Every structure is written in C-alpha cells, then in structure tokens.
Amino acid sequence: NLLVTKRDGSTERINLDKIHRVLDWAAEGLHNVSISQVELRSHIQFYDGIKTSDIHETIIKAAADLISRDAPDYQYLAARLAIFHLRKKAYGQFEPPALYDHVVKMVEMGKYDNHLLEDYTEEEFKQMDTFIDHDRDMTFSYAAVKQLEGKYLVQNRVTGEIYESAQFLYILVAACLFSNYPRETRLQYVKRFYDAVSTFKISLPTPIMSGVRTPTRQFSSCVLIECGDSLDSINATSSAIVKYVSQRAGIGINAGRIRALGSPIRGGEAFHTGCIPFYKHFQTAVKSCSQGGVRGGAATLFYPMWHLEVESLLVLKNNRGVEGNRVRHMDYGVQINKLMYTRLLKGEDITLFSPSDVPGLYDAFFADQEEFERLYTKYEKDDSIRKQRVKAVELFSLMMQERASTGRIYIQNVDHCNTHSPFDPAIAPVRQSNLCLEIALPTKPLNDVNDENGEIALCTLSAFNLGAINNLDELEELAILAVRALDALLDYQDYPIPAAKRGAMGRRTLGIGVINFAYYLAKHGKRYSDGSANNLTHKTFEAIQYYLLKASNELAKEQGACPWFNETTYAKGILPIDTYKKDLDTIANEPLHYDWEALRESIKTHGLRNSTLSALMPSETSSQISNATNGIEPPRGYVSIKASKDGILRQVVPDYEHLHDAYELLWEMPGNDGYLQLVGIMQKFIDQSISANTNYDPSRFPSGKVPMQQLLKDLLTAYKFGVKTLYYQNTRDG
Amino acid sequence: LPFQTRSNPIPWINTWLVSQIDSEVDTDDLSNFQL
Ligand SMILES: Nc1ncnc2c1ncn2[C@H]1C[C@H](O)[C@@H](COP(=O)(O)OP(=O)(O)OP(=O)(O)O)O1
Numbered sequence: 001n002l003l004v005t006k007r008d009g010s011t012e013r014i015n016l017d018k019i020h021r022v023l024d025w026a027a028e029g030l031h032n033v034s035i036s037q038v039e040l041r042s043h044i045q046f047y048d049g050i051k052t053s054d055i056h057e058t059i060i061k062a063a064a065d066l067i068s069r070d071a072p073d074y075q076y077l078a079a080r081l082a083i084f085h086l087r088k089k090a091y092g093q094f095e096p097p098a099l100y101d102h103v104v105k106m107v108e109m110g111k112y113d114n115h116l117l118e119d120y121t122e123e124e125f126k127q128m129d130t131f132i133d134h135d136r137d138m139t140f141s142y143a144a145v146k147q148l149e150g151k152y153l154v155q156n157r158v159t160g161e162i163y164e165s166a167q168f169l170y171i172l173v174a175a176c177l178f179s180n181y182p183r184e185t186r187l188q189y190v191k192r193f194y195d196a197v198s199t200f201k202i203s204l205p206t207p208i209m210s211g212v213r214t215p216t217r218q219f220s221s222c223v224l225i226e227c228g229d230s231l232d233s234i235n236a237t238s239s240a241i242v243k244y245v246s247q248r249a250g251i252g253i254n255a256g257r258i259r260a261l262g263s264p265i266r267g268g269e270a271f272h273t274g275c276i277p278f279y280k281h282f283q284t285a286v287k288s289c290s291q292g293g294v295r296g297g298a299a300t301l302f303y304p305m306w307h308l309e310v311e312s313l314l315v316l317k318n319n320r321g322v323e324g325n326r327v328r329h330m331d332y333g334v335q336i337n338k339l340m341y342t343r344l345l346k347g348e349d350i351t352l353f354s355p356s357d358v359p360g361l362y363d364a365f366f367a368d369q370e371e372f373e374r375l376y377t378k379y380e381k382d383d384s385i386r387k388q389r390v391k392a393v394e395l396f397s398l399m400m401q402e403r404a405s406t407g408r409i410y411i412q413n414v415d416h417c418n419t420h421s422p423f424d425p426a427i428a429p430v431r432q433s434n435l436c437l438e439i440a441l442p443t444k445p446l447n448d449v450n451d452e453n454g455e456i457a458l459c460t461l462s463a464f465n466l467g468a469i470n471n472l473d474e475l476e477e478l479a480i481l482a483v484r485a486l487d488a489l490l491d492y493q494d495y496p497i498p499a500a501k502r503g504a505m506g507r508r509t510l511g512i513g514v515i516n517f518a519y520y521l522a523k524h525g526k527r528y529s530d531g532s533a534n535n536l537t538h539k540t541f542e543a544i545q546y547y548l549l550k551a552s553n554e555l556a557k558e559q560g561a562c563p564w565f566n567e568t569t570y571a572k573g574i575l576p577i578d579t580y581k582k583d584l585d586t587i588a589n590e591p592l593h594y595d596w597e598a599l600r601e602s603i604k605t606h607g608l609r610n611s612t613l614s615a616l617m618p619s620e621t622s623s624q625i626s627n628a629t630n631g632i633e634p635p636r637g638y639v640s641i642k643a644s645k646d647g648i649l650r651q652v653v654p655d656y657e658h659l660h661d662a663y664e665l666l667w668e669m670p671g672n673d674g675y676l677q678l679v680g681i682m683q684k685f686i687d688q689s690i691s692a693n694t695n696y697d698p699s700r701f702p703s704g705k706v707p708m709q710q711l712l713k714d715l716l717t718a719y720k721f722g723v724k725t726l727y728y729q730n731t732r733d734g
Numbered sequence: 735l736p737f738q739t740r741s742n743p744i745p746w747i748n749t750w751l752v753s754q755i756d757s758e759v760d761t762d763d764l765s766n767f768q769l
Pocket residue numbers: 228229230231232258259264265266267270271272273274
C-alpha cells in the first residue's frame with residue numbers, strides 16, 4: 001500500500017523482511033544483541049516515498065547507540081551495517097570490483113594521482129588484487145568505520161559521495177609508497193606493507209590515510225615554522241602557515257623573537273605595537289583555510305617564559321577581557337629551562353626582557369645553558385637595559401592558573417630538548433615544538449616565502465600497535481616496513497614552501513610512535529599509577545628505538561645517510577642511552593637487552609637515513625581505526641565517548657570481556673606521578689618528544705578545588721625525570 | 735533445558751513485566767625538591 005525509494009531511484013512495496021534480513025546478517029555470531037531492539041529503537045517513521053538510504057542510516061545510528069558495557073558486540077553490529085552502507089555508496093553493490101578497474105575509473109575522475117597507472121602495469125594491479133582480503137572490512141569497530149567515511153575514504157566534500165572502500169585505501173597507500181622501489185622487490189614490499197596496516201600492526205596518520213593516492217601530495221602532519229624579529233619574516237611565516245594548513249598540516253609557530261610592546265623601531269621613529277597584533281595575524285592565517293578539507297586548522301605558538309610580555313601572553317585564551325588583548329583560537333607553549341625552575345624553588349624573582357635588548361640571550365636560552373646563566377645574570381645587573389621584575393612564584397602561578405582553566409597552555413623544557421636530542425645544539429638547536437608537543441626539530445627563520453636560507457621542519461608520522469605484537473622481536477620487521485615507507489614518502493610528496501623542502505630532504509625527520517599502550521599494560525597485568533610498568537616500559541621502548549635505529553641504519557647502507565647527518569649527535573657516536581636524564585635510574589633498573597655497541601659502531605660507519613625516528617603522538621583519530629587505546633593515554637572509560645562529524649561515537653576498549661579488571665581507567669589513578677614516571681622512561685629512548693598529559697580530579701582534593709601546590713609539584717616531577725614537554729591538562733567534569 | 739542457551743531476544747519486554755584552584759604555595763616545601 002505504501003512505497004519506498006530504492007537506491008537506484010525505483011520504487012516498490014515496503015517489505016520489513018528486507019530490514020530483518022540485513023540485521024540478521026549483521027548480528028550473526030554476536031553475543032547479547034537484539035535485532036528486535038534495533039528496529040524499535042530506530043523509531044523509524046515510514047512515509048510514502050521514503051528513501052531506502054535514509055532507512056539504513058537510521059538503523060545504523062540506532063545500533064550504534066546500543067553500544068554498552070552489557071552489550072559490547074553492538075560495536076561490530078553497527079560497523080557491519082556501516083560497512084555495508086559504504087559499499088553501496090561507492091560501488092552500488094556489496095562485492096567490490098577488481099582493483100585495476102577501480103583505479104582506471106578513479107584516475108579519469110581526478111580522484112587518484114595518474115602516476116599509479118604509469119608506474120604499475122595491469123598485470124601488476126591484478127597481482128595486488130590477490131593480496132587484498134575484503135573480509136578484513138569485517139574487523140573494524142563502529143568508531144573505526146565512522147572515521148573512514150568521515151575523514152579517510154576519498155570523497156566529495158561538497159556532494160558527500162564516497163568513492164572507495166577500506167581495503168582499496170590500504171592497498172593503494174602501499175602501492176604509492178613503494179611505487180619507486182625496484183621491481184625486484186616492489187610487490188613484496190607492497191604486500192607486506194598492506195598486511196601490516198590492514199591487520200593493524202602499523203597505524204597511519206590522518207594525512208597519509210586520507211591523502212596518499214590523491215593528486216595533491218602533502219602528507220606530513222607537523223610543520224614547524226620559526227619567526228624572526230622583522231616584518232619580512234612575519235609575512236613569510238604567515239604565508240607558510242596558509243599554504244601548509246590548506247594541505248593537511250598542523251602548525252607550530254615560534255614567535256618568541258618578536259620584541260616587546262613599547263620597544264623602539266628605527267631608533268624611535270615608531271612605537272612597537274607588541275606581539276598580540278602579530279599573534280592575531282597568525283590566528284587568522286591558521287583559521288583562513290581548512291586542513292585539506294578534512295578538519296580545521298590548528299596551531300601552537302611558542303615564546304620563552306622570560307619574554308617581557310609573558311604576563312599578557314599567558315592570558316590570551318581565557319574568555320574574560322576585551323577582544324584587543326585576547327587571542328583565543330590558538331594554543332600556546334611556554335618555554336622554560338632549569339634556571340627558571342630554580343628561581344621558583346628558591347623563592348626569588350624572574351626578570352623579563354625583550355629579546356631585542358639582550359644580545360645572545362635568546363640563542364643561548366636553547367643551545368648553551370651555562371652561557372645563558374652568564375648572560376642572564378649579567379643583564380639583571382645592568383640598569384641601562386629595559387627590564388621588569390616578577391616573583392617566580394607569581395609567574396608560575398599565572399601560567400598554571402591559565403593552564404588549568406583552558407587546558408591548552410603547554411610547557412616545553414628547552415634544556416631537555418637540547419641536552420637529550422639527536423641534534424648538536426651548536427649547529428642545529430631545537431627552539432620550539434609542534435601542535436601536540438611531540439615534535440622537536442631544528443628550524444631557522446625565513447626572510448621571504450621563497451627564502452632558501454630559512455629552514456621549516458616537517459615530520460611524517462606512524463605508530464606501532466602494541467596490542468598487535470606477541471613478541472618484542474616482531475618490532476624488527478615492522479620497523480623496517482614503517483621506516484622504509486615513511487622515507488620513501490619524503491621523496492614521493494611535494495613541498496609548497498622551499499624552506500620546508502630544505503629541512504625534509506636535509507634531515508629526513510620521522511616520528512614513529514605507539515598506540516594501544518594501555519591495552520598493552522592490561523595484557524601484562526600492569527598499571528600506570530603504582531610503578532609496576534616501569535621495567536616493562538623500559539624493555540618495551542628500548543626495543544622500539546633499537547629496531548627503529550637499526551632499520552634506518554640498514555637503509556643508510558642502501559641509499560646513503562641523510563645529507564645533514566653530520567649535524568646530529570648520532571654522527572658523533574652518541575646514542576639516546578647516553579644523554580638521558582640520570583634520575584631515571586632511580587625508577588627503573590631494567591638493563592639494556594640489545595647490542596647498542598654494535599649499532600653505535602655501525603652508525604658511526606654508515607650513518608642513519610633519518611635524523612629522527614621516534615615520537616609519541618596522541619593519535620586521537622588514527623588510533624580509532626584499529627579500535628586501539630590512543631597513544632599512551634589510559635582510556636576514559638570501558639566505553640569511551642569520542643567526537644565525530646555525524647556526532648557521538650562509542651568506543652569499547654579492546655578485549656573488554658576478558659580484561660575489564662586489568663585496565664586502569666583515566667580517572668581511576670591517584671595522581672600523575674606514576675604516569676609521568678612512565679613518560680620519563682619512554683623519553684630515555686624517544687628521539688623527539690611525547691604528548692604527555694596531566695589529569696586532575698577536583699573531587700580527589702579537600703574542599704573540591706585543585707591545589708596549586710600539586711600542579712607545581714607534578715610540573716617539577718616531570719622536569720626531574722627529563723620530560724621534555726607537557727600537552728593537555730585534563731580536568732574532570734565532576 | 736530442551737533448547738540452546740541464549741540471551742533475551744527482546745530485552746525491551748522487561749519494562750512491561752515488573753513494577754576551582756587553591757592559590758596556596760609553600761616555597762619551603764618546593765625547595766626540598768632536587769632537579
Ligand atoms: N609600523 C610598525 N608598527 C608596529 N610594529 C612594527 C612596525 N614596523 C616594524 N614593526 C615590528 C615588527 C618587528 O618585530 C620589528 C622589526 O621590524 P622590521 O621589519 O625589522 O623593521 P626595520 O628593519 O625597518 O626596523 P628595525 O631597525 O627596528 O629592525 O618591529
């Protein structure tokens with residue numbers, strides 16, 4: 001009596017058995033799910049001419065909202081319905097076509113890069129189709145599929161039309177990355193790299209997932225730009241931000257060199273308006289474009305704690321005040337060194353300077369800690385230098401007060417970033433970080449958009465799934481595949497800013513981290529807070545760094561070390577196991593298990609293909625593909641609520657049925673000392689930095705308010721164990 | 735039991751069949767800390 005509208009446009013009589021059958025298929029083998037419950041909770045209202053695709057999307061939401069602790073298998077029921085929906089959207093049927101036939105149609109539409117048809121023959125495409133196992137789409141969770149359809153699968157950002165499925169995405173990321181490999185070993189690397197990412201051994205970042213196979217080649221997640229104290233440099237910095245934001249990149253800006261408000265210009269011809277008008281310019285640059293059409297542009301801005309405007313810069317994110325003195329849509333990282341912390345411990349003062357009035361103080365602040373103390377104490381005595389005194393306690397209180405309110409005021413320990421880094425501070429110091437405070441790479445400011453002398457640092461990412469390995473020696477093979485893939489990516493992609501290509505080709509910096517670390521600890525019966533995972537973390541992250549360096553070392557024998565390898569501490573025969581902060585020996589006594597001395601000699605002889613290798617990113621989005629716990633963070637709950645384009649997503653911890661007692665949830669931790677100790681142990685081996693979080697529950701403190709004493713003690717504890725950076729400060733909402 | 739064990743296929747039927755910051759700092763406590 002009533003009519004529905006099929007996907008092809010035709011109409012036919014309503015038949016509820018069709019809905020029953022598709023749900024019966026999705027619930028096969030699942031436990032504690034109910035086809036009946038999904039249909040009734042859909043509240044689906046039939047009208048004459050109702051689109052069959054609107055019907056299906058409605059029951060996907062209904063099944064997705066039933067994901068709970070008592071019925072976790074709904075994470076697979078909703079995913080199978082969503083995978084089924086995505087197949088019809090892209091192919092008009094469930095069974096995907098042949099790999100070659102798909103690539104041909106997509107290159108003509110301009111959705112793929114035409115180089116795929118030039119570097120691979122039809123006989124090779126048909127040979128890669130035997131590698132593909134399309135049944136692996138039936139292993140995703142619902143959150144994973146929603147990230148695919150929302151961000152990663154090639155799609156029209158105006159139409160909403162999906163063009164591909166999950167396995168074609170994986171196989172073509174492998175094809176593109178090894179497309180320039182010799183045909184003696186190319187298809188072997190393509191198969192192994194496809195197996196690695198489609199069975200969740202390796203995690204790939206958002207720009208690689210959403211980009212590698214498309215005509216526009218920019219796949220580095222992090223872009224670090226240093227700004228000099230000139231209008232030529234501010235214009236160059238701004239232009240680089242706009243270009244890289246529009247091509248899938250997140251920005252880290254170093255604007256600490258810009259002189260303070262009221263400083264003379266040309267001897268007094270003009271009055272300097274201050275940093276804030278230039279910060280506002282950087283903010284509109286970041287917000288001017290979307291991040292490759294996938295998400296919005298974000299940036300973190302860095303300045304030293306002793307900057308003359310620091311009290312005005314620390315309060316840029318709070319929502320009180322006028323718009324003239326507020327820059328709310330960017331995050332900030334305050335740069336601190338040992339001298340600053342010492343003034344806090346001794347209850348003395350901190351002198352604020354404009355970087356234009358203190359010769360050599362800014363450069364020494366990163367490269368030479370003794371020269372900094374010499375220049376700093378000298379300039380405090382000089383009464384002819386414009387300065388401002390603040391009690392170190394009050395300045396640290398202002399910073400942590402704004403850090404706790406917004407959660408987006410970050411800390412970078414610049415001395416740790418240079419005493420325990422792969423770079424020589426005299427040649428290539430580290431003066432900033434990135435958006436999420438895990439990247440620490442050298443930069444030099446630009447004087448023009450096309451300045452060949454400036455250096456912009458790019459970093460390409462990936463992650464090891466700690467929940468997918470059964471033996472630490474499995475990392476040896478995975479490190480080879482990951483390093484070879486990311487190194488071939490640097491030559492494969494394009495570079496919109498010449499200064500950015502300089503750093504990438506010169507240093508070839510990689511940032512490979514981990515995911516599922518919390519699930520990893522649960523399988524070993526360890527916890528974050530009690531320190532029971534200290535020795536396990538040491539043994540785990542020793543293997544990660546060792547097999548990473550070994551993989552990049554073997555690649556250096558094959559294709560030559562990176563051009564600027566001579567600027568690394570690796571070239572001088574210095575390993576991370578030499579420059580780590582010695583207080584870590586008081587929280588972990590696990591001995592080194594791998595032959596670091598043989599590698600040290602091999603690195604002296606053959607070098608490294610990449611200047612950096614390891615960095616622990618948060619992987620907020622990419623870790624959801626493998627349904628892993630993101631990065632090193634403990635999950636907020638057994639069923640976590642995460643954000644998405646369509647709305648809320650429920651994500652169940654892996655192996656919930658057998659390990660719900662083994663997990664230690666985020667707010668089940670007494671404090672941060674145990675977590676920060678693990679971060680310090682990881683930092684012993686990590687080349688760059690870690691997106692370390694601090695978490696605070698107000699209800700765990702007397703009178704329900706978090707003491708500044710604890711905020712500062714955890715901050716000092718992080719420095720005590722060599723933690724380079726501090727990312728989010730999560731405060732509980734209850 | 736004559737049939738295979740199974741969970742309730744219509745769980746909805748059970749409904750019908752029953753019934754900020756503490757600003758205090760102690761510098762002395764902080765100096766007893768070794769960096
Ligand atoms: N008209 C202006 N208003 C506010 N700030 C300015 C102005 N001109 C320059 N600045 C700021 C931006 C830089 O941080 C700093 C130096 O600018 P720059 O482009 O180097 O000028 P300049 O080379 O002509 O003068 P200077 O000799 O002071 O460097 O002063």
